[PDB]
Amino acid sequence: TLVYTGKYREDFEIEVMNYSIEEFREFKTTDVESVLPFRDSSTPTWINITGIHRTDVVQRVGEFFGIHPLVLEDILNVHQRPKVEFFENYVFIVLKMFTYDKNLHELESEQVSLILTKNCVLMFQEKIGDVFDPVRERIRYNRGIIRKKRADYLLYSLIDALVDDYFVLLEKIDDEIDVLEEEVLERPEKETVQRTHQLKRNLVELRKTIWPLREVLSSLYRDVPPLIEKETVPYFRDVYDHTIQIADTVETFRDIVSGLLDVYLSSVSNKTNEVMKVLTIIATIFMPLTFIAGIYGMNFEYMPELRWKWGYPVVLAVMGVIAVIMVVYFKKKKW
Amino acid sequence: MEEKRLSAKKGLPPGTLVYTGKYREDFEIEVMNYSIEEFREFKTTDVESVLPFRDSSTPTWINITGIHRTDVVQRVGEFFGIHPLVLEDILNVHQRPKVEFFE
């Protein structure tokens, strides 16, 4: 029980920001105990655990905050679609941050768990690197209204940063779509086909990850248990609409890339004709020549192979004439 | 389905109505006010001329060709009491056919 599933073993650090209307303190540490006392504090706190491959810390904080070990295993589980679970003590959501590489077109996903408990938010991540820097400066520099509100608005801000990163990823994918759409039409090779296959798989992954996100954000503003407070409904509504936008773009891109695949797949089944033509013309050309050469190659010791009128030039001339005749046999039916 | 209100789209000011098509060339308002006695055809470009026909007793047909000018659609909706979400649905083009019954 309580086993880590991902593939990250690089770094593990803990970060805490405690902000109020006037008070603010941000720090980083690597001891699980130091973040424990913040639970009973009335101030809105943000706790971040970058490395969850150390299961002991995860279990320790789970026991401290009085949460079910099943959701502990869900946090440790990494291959899972986003979901939302409303419990009386805490509300627990699962999201996925995406990263893209334009040099090598691949999509990397990281599972991130967010738990809201009264005046605290707990974030569990896979590796180091976040999309929450804008909200980090929002708390740090007091710009914006993040400090005035409670931890529900902090959950809203984290989800907003998530969907903003989704928008950036969609911009990168749109540029890739344009490049590939031009290249497939005007540069047909195998690398284009491999890139199109990779792009289709990446868009399928995006669809499978984003469609449950719509349901999560719908739940966070329709069911709205007392944890989120009635003052935060419109913001989650806005994030829900943003998720709708991201979806609709995802299906549009999927349709376009499927059309590209269909075009290339239609271009195939005519290379068979060309290659068959090449094979059959070279066979019809060169099998007769080999046939005659072998026939004159047999040593029966009684063949009229004497010089006479020079046999070798005559044989070569006749063979070349036969080859030219076989060539002329083609192109009559447009071969 | 729950309640309905204007969607919030990233990158736009709140409550902004945008035409989502590709045609931005033509605009006219053609009005046919007909009755049992005689008809009235009136093609124009000014938008204030057609607005008073909301209270006309005889049947009226107000054909606005060209919705790329969102201000005309917004003015017509504001005068006729059309809900802003209905105006957004008018302007939004990527939409399957549908019907909605209001009061």
């Epitope: 911009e171 936008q245 549009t252 | 990158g11 736009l12 902004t16 790329h68 969102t70």
Partner: antibody, heavy 123, light 106 residues
Framework: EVQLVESGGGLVQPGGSLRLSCAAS????????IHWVRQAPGKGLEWVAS????????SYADSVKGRFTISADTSKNTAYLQMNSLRAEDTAVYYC???????????????????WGQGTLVT | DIQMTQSPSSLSASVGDRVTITCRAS??????VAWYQQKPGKAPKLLIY???SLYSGVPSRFSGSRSGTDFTLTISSLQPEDFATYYC?????????FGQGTKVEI
Amino acid sequence: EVQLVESGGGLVQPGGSLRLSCAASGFNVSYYSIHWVRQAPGKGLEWVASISSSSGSTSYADSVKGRFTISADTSKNTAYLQMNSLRAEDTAVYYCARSYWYYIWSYSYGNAMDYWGQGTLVT
Amino acid sequence: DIQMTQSPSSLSASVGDRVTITCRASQSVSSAVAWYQQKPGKAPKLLIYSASSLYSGVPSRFSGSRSGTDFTLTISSLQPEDFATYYCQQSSSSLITFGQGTKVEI
């Protein structure tokens, strides 16, 4: 019919202030977005600010943030840009341009300014 | 901030020629690039929006193309009225950014 007129320009002392007024005719500033575009003498165009009067959301370039302030009055169909703490690089010709939005994909929108005024010189 | 560069900084051509001016965007702007024309001493005039669409009433000599993250404005056949400066907008973000402009002269 659609027309934009710029006024309020003129020479001013450094570190001072100057209010530029953009009067719009033939269209309602409430339904559209209004941008201020700055062109230095013998230089390329630069973006100053944008106002969406219906929503009240304003946007500023990072090079004039804070010093410049943009607002709009719907009653007079006017767009005001008041400039404080003017510096040496601000001497330029200011144009006022109305822009609409267009749809590329369900996640991305762009705007293109249709009608521009004659522009006013500020030193 | 999204920085656009544009080349060439000045292009010389005669009437009847084809002229291409290309913008490169540092970041990724989806397709919200706009091409404007400014004659000396007068306000700019919008030519192309959405990287491939023509503003109403603009002559079909101008055309636009987008390869991924760089865009091209191509004039098939010049005319004496097309000898002006050409500018380049990105509008994906709320902060519009211009190019430095290319002066097409004789």
